[PDB]
Design a protein around this nucleic acid. Structure first.
Ligand SMILES: Nc1ncnc2c1ncn2[C@@H]1O[C@H](COP(=O)(O)OP(=O)(O)OP(=O)(O)O)[C@@H](O)[C@H]1O
Ligand SMILES: [Mg+2]
Ligand SMILES: [Zn+2]
Lengths: 58, 615, 43
DNA sequence: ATCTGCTTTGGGTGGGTGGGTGGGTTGAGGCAATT
DNA sequence: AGCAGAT
């Protein structure tokens, strides 16, 4: 088992957490977090953000 | 290493310290409450008041159970008692009252794992300073408390850097002076935490010197038993650092003897005392006077001479409206109402500078005083520069005056380089540096207050003003108000001035009694309030000022037809007039700029020069 | 490692018994075969 | 694994056949160019 | 005193 030195947080859990974040995430979550939900559109906010960012980077 | 028998036993002193901490009261015990706050992560600095120790000692004596003199022992040798007190606190730290996230802390997890490893090994630690989260300081023995209990307080008695001699080393003393240099805060290492790439253990090393030699080979029991050679490596995440800062304290002018030069002394600040000293402050630093031994070869070469410094432990820092303000600006001179009014207008410097079209009209009123030697130019400059919060006094510094009035004395003498610098400042309000070593550009929206003498040393009526002034005509034009003060002999005025100066010399106070000058603090706060405000102007006032401008331009052209005129009016004069009106309105505290303010500004510009030239 | 040599990532691997060994390197931070290879090579 | 031996800081108790692109930085005095 | 080398 891999653990960061001096802490009690697993590296595997971190990797899976960030992978889940990247494969599935939308700007609408950010908008609701900042209390800007009423500005949510129907196309850009509902489309995966970082997946598009990875595709364009490739 | 022979031995002596000193009349001090540290066991009774340690017992006394513990009793003082657990029992003293001045609610519950004061120091126990402070320790409770320290445990809950609220507090990170414990200050021991020697006054409290004296009070506790005298209370014990009154009860009849006389004990050892703790305060004198602390004062005579203070380095040891820091560690003694820290140990006493470590022994009696109360349990926390508020739950905290232990797992978040790196050290808690590391020490838990160390405990687990030790338990496993047994089934088949770390220095005390590592876990400390507080700093201990000594507050000196106050003079009043020492006098109350019939004792002498060496610690709180102030000393100059000269009086701090070589026999004071190792004591708790106080120094008086002004700080001349403070270094940046930086991390000083107390305990170093290593790691073993093979054994999986951690080592700790204590550092109490300017230098140290890092460990390179594992010393863990497992490594030695197995003989495995595991290299030790540093880890900054687990080490313990204390904020460090080095300052310098210099003698005051009044403390240096006759025909001598001032001396300076180093100061070390650690823990939560950092950032409590800045250059220019006059302070009473209390600290422990210690040497700074050299190391290695330098120690061998240096001989027996030793550097010294002070471990800071406690720092004590030392401390009709128009007419009234004008007369109160400088009561020790003979009244110059117009000049004082203009200087107050300069001080407030009201302006609405929001053109936003690419650049804006200058937002500072500049004043120039030019007069034959004998009139109070330097005194006016000194007073107007002390009153202002940003005033900077120089002789023919600008950075310090940014967004403030600049006090330039002997303006005429100044060198061409500084003349070009000010010319740049007025036009662009910017400080530009173009050097290979550094390239930094700073804005400078600062006002200038200049004092100069005519070309020949005195004003010559035969020659016109322009010829009398050495400075370029453009520079004079750029000034918002140019004041020409002359010294005309006269029986009555001379008698009044002589009586004033002579009364001041005999009694050391203002002679005038018809009116009472306003307190400087009230004037300063009112000036700041006025600076905070923002007036406005209408269209009718705009038309009035426009009409005044055409009248002034016609009159100035007619005057320029002759050689007597200082200089024909220009749009700069219009901008100056409106600037003065805005400042006057700011003084009035009213948005709407009254015609009265414009009229007063016009009168001020007229009397700036014509009033005395026509004489 | 993508980052430079002085980035400074530290590891704690858990043995089948409750003891923790220390390894250095991002590759170790990600992988276990690399961690064991480094453990062997550092001897 | 133990015994033998050189060299610092920075500074004139190493020097100018090591120099100043290896650091020790103000003060005075002479010279060309600028005036 | 720390480190560089020969027995
Ligand atoms: N109206 C006055 N009342 C009292 N003292 C005055 C007055 N005018 C001038 N003095 C005195 O004149 C002395 C010289 O003045 P100050 O040094 O301020 O200016 P100055 O001599 O014109 O300047 P400079 O140094 O440029 O020649 C000061 O001691 C000041 O006290
Ligand atoms: Mg003067
Ligand atoms: Zn080890």
């Amino acid at each position: 088992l891999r653990i960061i030195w001096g802490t009690n947080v697993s590296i595997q859990e971190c990797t899976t957490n960030f992978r889940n974040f990247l494969m599935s995430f939308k700007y609408k979550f950010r908008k609701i977090l900042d209390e800007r939900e009423e500005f949510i559109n129907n196309t850009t906010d509902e489309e995966l953000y970082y997946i598009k960012q990875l595709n364009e980077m490739r | 290493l022979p031995s002596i028998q000193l009349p001090v036993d540290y066991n009774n002193l340690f017992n006394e310290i513990t009793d003082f901490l657990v029992t003293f009261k001045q609610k519950g015990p004061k120091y126990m409450a402070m320790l409770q706050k320290v445990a809950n992560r609220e507090l990170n600095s414990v200050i021991i008041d020697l006054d409290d120790i004296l009070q506790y000692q005298n209370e014990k004596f009154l009860q009849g159970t006389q004990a050892d003199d703790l305060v004198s022992a602390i004062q005579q040798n203070a380095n040891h008692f820091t560690e003694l007190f820290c140990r006493a606190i470590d022994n009696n730290m109360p349990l926390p009252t508020k739950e905290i996230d232990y797992k978040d802390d790196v050290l808690d997890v590391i020490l838990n794992q160390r405990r687990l490893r030790n338990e496993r090994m047994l089934s088949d630690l770390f220095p005390p300073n590592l876990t400390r989260r507080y700093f201990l300081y000594f507050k000196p023995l106050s003079q009043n408390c020492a006098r109350r209990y019939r004792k002498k307080a060496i610690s709180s008695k102030p000393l100059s850097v000269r009086q701090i001699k070589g026999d004071f080393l190792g004591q708790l003393i106080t120094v008086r002076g002004i700080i001349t240099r403070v270094s940046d805060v930086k991390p000083a290492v107390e305990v170093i935490a290593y790691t073993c790439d093979q054994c999986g253990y951690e080592v700790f090393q204590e550092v109490n010197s300017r230098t140290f030699t890092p460990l390179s080979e594992c010393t863990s029991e497992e490594c030695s038993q197995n003989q495995t050679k595991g290299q030790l490596f540093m880890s900054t995440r687990a080490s313990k650092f204390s904020a460090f800062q080095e300052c310098k304290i210099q003698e005051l002018s009044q403390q240096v003897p006759v025909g001598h030069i001032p001396r300076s002394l180093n100061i070390h600040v650690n823990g939560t005392l950092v950032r409590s000293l800045s250059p220019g402050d006059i302070v009473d630093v209390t600290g422990i006077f210690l040497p700074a031994p050299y190391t290695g070869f330098k120690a061998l070469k240096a001989g027996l001479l030793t550097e010294t410094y002070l471990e800071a432990q406690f720092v004590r820092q030392h401390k009709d409206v128009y007419n009234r303000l004008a007369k109160s600006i400088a009561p020790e001179i003979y009244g110059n109402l117009d000049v004082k009014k203009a200087l107050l207008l300069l001080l407030v410097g009201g302006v609405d500078k929001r053109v936003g079209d690419g650049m804006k009209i200058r937002g500072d009123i500049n004043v120039c005083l030019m007069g034959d030697p004998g009139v109070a130019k330097s005194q006016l400059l000194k007073a107007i520069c002390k009153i202002s919060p940003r005033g900077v006094y120089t002789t023919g510094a600008l950075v310090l005056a940014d967004n403030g009035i600049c006090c330039i004395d002997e303006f005429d003498k100044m060198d061409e380089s500084d003349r070009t610098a000010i010319h740049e400042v007025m036009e662009q309000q910017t400080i530009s540096i173009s050097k290979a070593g550094i390239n930094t550009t700073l804005n400078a929206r600062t006002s200038i207050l200049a004092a100069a003498n005519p070309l020949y040393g005195r004003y010559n009526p035969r020659l016109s003003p322009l010829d009398n002034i050495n400075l370029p005509a453009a520079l004079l034009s750029r000034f918002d108000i140019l004041f020409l003060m002359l010294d005309i002999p006269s029986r009555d005025d001379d008698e009044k001035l002589a009586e004033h100066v002579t009364y001041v010399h005999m009694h050391n106070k203002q002679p005038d009694l018809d009116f009472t000058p306003v307190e400087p603090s009230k004037m300063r706060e009112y000036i700041a309030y006025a600076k905070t405000k923002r007036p406005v102007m209408s269209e009718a006032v705009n038309d009035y000022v426009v009409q005044a401008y055409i009248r002034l331009r016609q009159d100035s052209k007619r005057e320029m037809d002759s050689k007597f005129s200082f200089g024909q009016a220009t749009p700069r004069t219009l901008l100056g007039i409106i600037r003065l009106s805005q400042a006057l309105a700011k003084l009035r505290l009213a948005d709407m700029v009254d015609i009265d303010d414009v009229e007063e500004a016009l009168r001020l510009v007229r009397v700036s020069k014509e009033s005395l030239y026509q004489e | 490692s993508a980052r430079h040599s002085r980035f400074g990532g530290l590891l704690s691997i858990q043995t089948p018994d409750k003891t923790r060994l220390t390894v250095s390197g991002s590759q170790a931070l990600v992988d276990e075969k690399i961690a064991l290879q480094k453990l062997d090579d550092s001897k």
